[PDB]
Design a protein around this ligand. Structure first.
Ligand SMILES: [Mg+2]
Ligand SMILES: [Mg+2]
Ligand SMILES: [Mg+2]
Ligand SMILES: [Mg+2]
Ligand SMILES: [Mg+2]
Ligand SMILES: [Mg+2]
Ligand SMILES: [Mg+2]
Ligand SMILES: [Mg+2]
Ligand SMILES: [Mg+2]
Ligand SMILES: [Mg+2]
Ligand SMILES: [Mg+2]
Ligand SMILES: [Mg+2]
Ligand SMILES: [Zn+2]
Lengths: 116, 54, 122, 86, 164, 48, 69
RNA sequence: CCAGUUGACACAAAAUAGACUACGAAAGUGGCUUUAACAUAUCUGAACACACAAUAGCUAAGACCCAAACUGGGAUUAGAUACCCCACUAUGCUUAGCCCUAAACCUCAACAGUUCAACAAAACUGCUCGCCAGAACACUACGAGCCACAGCUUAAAACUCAAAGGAC
RNA sequence: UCACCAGUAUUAGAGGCACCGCCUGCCCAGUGACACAUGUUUAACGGCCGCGGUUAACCGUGCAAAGGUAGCAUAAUCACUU
């Protein structure tokens, strides 16, 4: 629920203290916050670990650790496919938040009127 | 301000002024002692003369 | 004024608890009070393994000894309680029913911002 | 120390899906209000900086609540061309 | 300074406690009362002793008595824990208000003012004119001036007595 | 915001909670297990 | 606004601090001399008062101690 | 004698409520209990006065988890006496004394009442205490006063200026 | 258990300086004392630098412990010195 906010700004009638000192005016802007994207995460951790364990048990031959290297390559291909799917969905469907353009146009249809 | 403060302080005052020659002397009679030279400030540039008069 | 003793004891048998209650009541009466009521929540489990000079126990009661002690005696009674060994702890708070409740009627409709910025086209 | 050992913050797990229990514990900690507390306790927060942080947090929270209310109120208009007159 | 056995003010009007269980009579006593009850009892006693119109709480006499009782309470408080300087400021402001009220009463009535002064006991001392804030230098200067005045007075007396 | 109490009522409730925590009538770092039979009073966001 | 007045004030304060640090013993000597001159002036004023206050030779039994230790 | 469970376990403060405007003349003050209580049912009224007053620094009284200026080193640039790290002296503290500063700024004075130069908190009506009407010099010298001796309150004078300054 | 002692770390013994005020800045290469797991101690013995430059800062530097910090000044302070 919207909390109180009367006795928080430094105003004429207000005889209290300014517990809330906003650095900018509280005016609902016609834009919305942008959704973050991209992050150096480097996926494929479980397959990397199992491949490292296999290579430690054996040496470096591809015919020995085939059971693990095949899964590692499959997981790498799946990660590439997931990256491509995310890049595609960035323009089709956004997960979590909605397209900022929708709210931008909605506010453009009925913008703010603070200056009367 | 209020009238009480203006009454306690009072109207302003007209202080005097004084140039170099005290007692009001627009035309003085000095004696020359030196005839050195001096240059102006940064913008202006010259080598005008400057005498040490008493 | 009225007061209430939040006596918190352990599961230290019946006669020992009775003797401690008698001692506390005698002290309260000597301080100039009048016994109002005597209640207790039974020697049940404690909210956490607490020490009481100086063993750990997990089973203790919450005896309530109401009284009408004077004004300048609460700190002395708290110090006396802290001095006791069998008593775990307990802050003597005034009677709760004595505080006349201020008749409130739910939340009121808080209005929106009542003018906070100038009127300029900017 | 003087409190019971294994009772609280005991998010059980099952079905070999620790990610679900991990997210549940994360949500619990976030709703309780201690992750940010520990993150700020990583170093000493000056009283001036602490008050500034609290003020900024309150302001951002009020703004976010107002924006959420406005969105919940104005999400109705999302058709396309109902009139087509112009 | 009422005795520690008298009943309260609001409880004395009703006769329900005058003839009731001894526990209630013992609980509703000054010994078991609070500071506000003692203050009210003292105010009532002073009003009945000095003020000829009791239960006023509007004129200047009742207000002056209340201010004096408040100043006494502030003094009793500042007795222990003197570091509380906010209470000292409140005490100074209350003393100033009491002085103003006494001045107003004296300007309005002189006989009643003298009666109140004799009753309460607060002497009416004139306030110091100027607050030049004397210092060590000025103090010793004034002392030397007084000494020189006495010496020159004695010298003039001797000179006058010289003529036989 | 989630509980939905008034100023005075919430203040009294939290004061009583703190008094019980200090004196020793309620666990501080957890909830009393001997009194769990409580209907859904608050909107427990966690656990849905 | 810009912090120019206050920055210049702080610079002047730092210059004064450097001045006091580089030289302070001569300042203390000048202060001692000023205190001595003030004491001498006070004694002369007391003597003038004694002379112009009718009687002379200064009242007996009085002492004029020196202030400032 | 370091990292992880448990057992006798900090003279500093309380997290979610802190998504509350609460109390004070100001700084300021929120885990609980208490000894007392916040003048004015006419207002303003002293920086010739009375009460004081964030932190800052000092003399003793013990040291603390942590940090602790200057310090020792490590990689560092021609140079680091700083930006990363480890420990510490006075110190962040109370038990006894102080000095009397602030971006003490919400830089919007108190009392009763009404519907704009620009940033900001739109204008004011009647009354009252204090201050100013150029900048560096000038949180200064000289005076005066102070338990303060490299300190603090008011506080200038000659010279230079064509200026200093706030908003967009 | 003859004093130091019929005393006990705020108590005694061996030393440097000179009450009170501002201060006691740097250095264990060398000697001494600490086995302090290789380091401490300079209020211990002792020491706090040179060459060329627009009457000097700052440059190029060599060596170690620092290279005289504050302060006072023709000194009871090597002729210069009257
Ligand atoms: Mg105080
Ligand atoms: Mg700005
Ligand atoms: Mg403390
Ligand atoms: Mg102040
Ligand atoms: Mg530490
Ligand atoms: Mg340093
Ligand atoms: Mg320390
Ligand atoms: Mg402030
Ligand atoms: Mg006034
Ligand atoms: Mg003023
Ligand atoms: Mg030395
Ligand atoms: Mg010589
Ligand atoms: Zn409530």
């Amino acid at each position: 629920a919207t909390p109180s906010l009367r006795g928080r700004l430094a105003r004429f009638g207000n005889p209290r203290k300014p517990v809330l000192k906003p650095n900018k005016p509280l005016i609902l802007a016609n834009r919305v916050g942008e959704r973050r994207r991209e992050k150096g995460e480097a996926t494929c951790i479980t397959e990397m670990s199992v491949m490292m364990a296999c290579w430690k048990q054996n040496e470096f031959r591809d015919d020995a650790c085939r059971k693990e290297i095949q899964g590692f390559l499959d997981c790498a291909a799946r990660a590439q496919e997931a990256r491509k799917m995310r890049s595609i969905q960035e323009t089709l469907g956004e997960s979590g938040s909605l397209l900022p353009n929708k709210l931008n146009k909605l506010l453009q249809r009925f913008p703010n009127k603070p200056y009367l | 301000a209020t009238l009480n403060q203006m009454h306690r302080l009072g109207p302003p005052k007209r202080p005097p002024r004084k140039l170099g020659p005290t007692e009001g002397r627009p035309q003085l009679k000095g004696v020359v002692l030196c005839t050195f030279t001096r240059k102006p400030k940064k913008p202006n540039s010259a080598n005008r003369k400057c005498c040490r008069v008493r | 004024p009225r007061y209430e003793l939040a006596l918190i004891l352990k599961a230290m048998q019946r006669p020992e608890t009775a003797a401690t209650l008698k001692r506390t009541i005698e002290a309260l009466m000597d301080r100039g009070a009048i016994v109002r009521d005597l209640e207790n929540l039974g020697e049940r489990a404690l909210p956490y393994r607490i020490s009481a000079h100086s063993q750990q126990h997990n089973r203790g009661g919450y005896f309530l000894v109401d009284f009408y002690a004077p004004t300048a005696a609460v700190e002395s009674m708290v110090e006396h309680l802290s001095r006791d060994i069998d008593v775990i702890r307990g802050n003597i708070v005034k009677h709760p029913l004595t505080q006349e409740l201020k008749e409130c009627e739910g939340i009121v409709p808080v209005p929106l911002a009542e003018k906070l910025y100038s009127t300029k086209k900017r | 120390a003087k409190h019971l050992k294994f009772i609280a913050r005991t998010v059980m797990v099952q079905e070999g899906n620790v990610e679900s229990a991990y997210r549940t514990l994360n949500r619990i900690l976030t709703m309780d209000g201690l992750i940010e507390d520990i993150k700020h306790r990583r170093y000493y927060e000056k009283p001036c900086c602490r008050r500034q942080r609290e003020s900024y947090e309150r302001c951002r929270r009020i703004y976010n609540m107002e924006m959420a209310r406005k969105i919940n109120f104005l999400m109705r208009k999302n058709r396309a061309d109902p009139w087509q007159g112009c | 300074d009422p005795p520690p056995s008298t009943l309260l003010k609001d409880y004395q009007n009703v006769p329900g406690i005058e003839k009731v269980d001894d526990v209630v009579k013992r609980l509703l006593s000054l010994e078991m009362a609070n500071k506000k009850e003692m203050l009210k009892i003292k105010q009532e006693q002073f009003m009945k002793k000095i003020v000829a119109n009791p239960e006023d709480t509007r004129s200047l006499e009742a207000r002056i008595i209340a201010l004096s009782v408040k100043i006494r309470s502030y003094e009793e408080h500042l007795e222990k824990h003197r570091k509380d300087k906010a209470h000292k400021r409140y005490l100074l402001m209350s003393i100033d208000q009491r002085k103003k009220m006494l001045k107003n009463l004296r300007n309005t009535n002189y006989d009643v003012f003298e009666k109140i002064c004799w009753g309460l006991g607060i002497e009416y001392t004139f306030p110091p004119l100027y607050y030049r804030r004397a210092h060590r230098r000025f103090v010793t200067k004034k002392a030397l001036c007084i000494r020189v005045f006495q010496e020159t007075q004695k010298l003039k007396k001797r000179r006058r007595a010289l003529k036989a | 915001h989630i509980t939905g109490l008034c100023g005075k009522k919430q203040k009294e409730i939290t004061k009583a909670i703190k008094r019980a925590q200090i004196m020793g009538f309620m666990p501080v770092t957890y909830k009393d297990p001997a009194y769990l039979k409580d209907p859904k009073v608050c909107n427990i966001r966690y656990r849905e | 606004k810009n912090v120019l007045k206050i920055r210049r004030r702080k610079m002047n304060h730092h210059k004064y601090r450097k001045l006091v640090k580089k030289t302070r013993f001569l300042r203390r000597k000048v202060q001692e001399g000023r205190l001595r001159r003030k004491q001498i002036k006070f004694e002369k004023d007391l003597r003038r008062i004694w002379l112009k206050a009718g009687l002379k030779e200064a009242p007996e039994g009085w002492q004029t101690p020196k202030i400032y230790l």
